[PDB]
């Protein structure tokens, strides 16, 4: 069998095109089928340059891109996979400066077999339960490559799910997004990145996504769904916690202003209160006016299925049979008596 | 004579920069020197063809921009004009899908000239006793205009009433303000309109031009003072007092529910903002969306929501309201009957 060392010398001596890839496609042959104990012979050296030549390729400018440029990027990615499938290879990937930017990078729509693999490689690394947070490693990788390119982080992922792409594609979009909202232990994490999506055109998506004939895409829905809901309980009972403490007028209202100043929530908040002042001053009706009220606020600031309101959208949605024919005069009538 | 025919043509082959002027101001002249008839002949078709001219202009890049767009827009504005100086042309202006934005995006500070026409125009619609919302269509014209370019809708109304403005800006601005407020039914709706201006600095901006030495700048403050006053007492009618202290405003407020069954839910709505999500970000455009619902429900009168930047609910806010009404008196007379 061929050594590590064969790889790594011939990797270094600048192959292009098919040459570059001749030696890729044995490489990952050799990765896939030879025991940890070669890959550790392989080893940091062997990762650093694979991921120096898909770095030079990442970086290569449209006009001097060889044609075979995807085709070596994506057999070098088929190469981490194998190289990461052992617990050896995924530690010193971690350990790499950039192995998580590049497979972020990797994630590009226009090669779609090539971003399902890198997609399922964040996703593993998603769920990895040490080092701990590596979710928000993952995350960061993603600001930091929207950063470079000026564009919003979760766009690939979001360009990924059109309709146009394989069910493939759309299932390691969406396995990847779940990977990053479901490991958190914070809420607000979730919340903010599940209302990042949205703001980013995800709830059409998901509408266009259930109608899918797929029962991989039905679970990774499902999953979504679930955290969306489990969510909303946790910030339901944060609500409860937040009745039981808060219940003297002054202390509210002090808090609010102290949340609020100096913030562009400032004038709004005038407003509601300025507003308040102009219910209807009507003994039967003031009552029912400072219900709906409630129930409105109730249902913007406790928004189902765990994400922000769409403040884009026109109308919102509010559940109202909560609250409400000739049965009214004819039960007046028990004035019989 | 030219014939509105010959003019609709013209104005439909692509004339540019001082051919397009002359066209135009020809056309001016010609609607206010014909009979009516002949405006009838120009017509909804010769006004369409002039709100396509000014929607192009309007939409126009800086860098591709012709150095007449400006003189161009502003002659348009002189013919709107002269086309509505008769009930034809203003009833048909009314009927467009867009003549009443592209009016107010008219209202540019850069040309304070055009702005002066079209803030004059503006007011006359509102005036207007029918149609009976005309200053509701003429503040949703304003709303989208604010979405577009993105601002404060009664921010050019303010820029208009800055201190290095014309005198007849300013008091143009001013009349304009006043005719959204003051041809209004409903108190409600004054009070929304003043205390918004009022929040985007309209008091300040007030006590300066209390200053300036000019009658028709005064008859557009007392205006102004007068309804705002006989506002005040309405109000203090309705509460027996200050809108734009916290701590007033709150206590007001409290007085106002106390010992009621409205109490309950005014806590539980001050504690529902405290679960707005602690984002930089979303926590203003929260309040934001509260407020403009409750703003809604308050507004709301028999089917009609007067204010279409409050228009989140599709719902019949107070044929809802009597529903809720309806079944507390059907509890009450039915626990009497029981009993
Ligand atoms: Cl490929």
Known sequence: ???????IQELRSGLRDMHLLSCLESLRVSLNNNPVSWVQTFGAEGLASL?????????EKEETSGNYDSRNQHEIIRCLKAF???????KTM?????GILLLVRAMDPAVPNMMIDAAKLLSALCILPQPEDMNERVLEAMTERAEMDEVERFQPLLDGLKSGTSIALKVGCLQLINALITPAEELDFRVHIRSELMRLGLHQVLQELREIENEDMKVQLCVFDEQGDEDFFDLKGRLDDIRMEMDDFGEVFQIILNTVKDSKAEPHFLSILQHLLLVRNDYEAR???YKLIEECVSQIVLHKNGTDPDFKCR???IDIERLVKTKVEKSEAKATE
Do not use: C, V, W
């Open 1 to 7: 069998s061929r050594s590590a060392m064969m790889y």
């Open 287 to 289: 009552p029912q006016y």
């Open 51 to 59: 991921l120096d030549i898909l770095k030079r390729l990442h970086d």
């Open 94 to 98: 971690l350990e790499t400066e950039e």
């Open 315 to 317: 109308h919102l949605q």
């Open 84 to 90: 990461m499938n052992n617990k050896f290879g995924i």
